[model samples]
Target: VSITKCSSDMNGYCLHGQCIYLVDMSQNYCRCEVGYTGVRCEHFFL
Candidate 1:
């Protein structure tokens, strides 16, 4: 099987994590790293 790579226009600020595409759902969203969670993963965890 073959799969396509995901892309995001919200470049930069990927130090924590990156935006990925859900191949099965064809959805584009952010994948925050540890201690981070938000629309752009710019917030910290409490």
Candidate 2:
């Protein structure tokens, strides 16, 4: 599988996670929350 990043996501690019925007450094990633796991927090498990 593969994960993709984006310039911005107003509708939740992270989905079940927090879309971390390092605007200062021009970088980003999904700060996955509980019960979720993935580059964009698009997966989950027990």
Candidate 3:
């Protein structure tokens, strides 16, 4: 059986920042906004 992976689920866009992908999708991460951070820009930099 072959399983197809969802690209949308593997990658995401930040509403307050930008998305950065490393070597591959597994190393995908977000570059938060000016004062925001976290996987989904859910945190603020104090």
Candidate 4:
């Protein structure tokens, strides 16, 4: 499935088949879906 929380600056974060948060330092912001966490949100269990 496609998560609405995937980041364009995900050059260092990749969670296959899971939800993750996107952190953009250039934009200085963070975003995540309903079930995600971490600075890069690279953890998901569902």
State each model's CA lDDT, in order.
0.59, 0.58, 0.57, 0.45
Give stretches of model 3 more than 4 Å off. Answer: 1-13, 24-26, 37-39, 43-46
Residue range with the least summed lDDT across 10 consecutive positions in model 2: 1-10
Q: Write the per-residue lDDT of candidate 1 for residues 1-46, one digit (tens) a residue.
A: 2334455555454556765556667755456776766546676766
- For every candidate in turn, the CA RMSD to the true structure comes to 3.8, 7.9, 7.9, 7.9
TM-score of each: 0.48, 0.43, 0.39, 0.29
TM-score of 2: 0.43
Compose the digit string of candidate 2's lDDT tens values, residues 1-46. 2444454535356677665455556655557777754556666755
Clashing pairs in 1: none
| Model 4, runs deviating above 4 Å | 1-27, 37-39
Highest TM-score among the candidates is held by which one? 1
Tens-place lDDT digits, model 3, residues 5-46: 335565455666656555444555566677764657766766
Indicate the TM-score of model 3: 0.39
Give one digit per residue, the lDDT tens place, for model 4 in 1-46: 3234535565344343343443443232334445765545567755
Q: What is the lDDT of residue 39 in candidate 3?
A: 55
Over 4 Å off, model 1 = 1-15, 37-40
Better of 2 and 4 by TM-score: 2
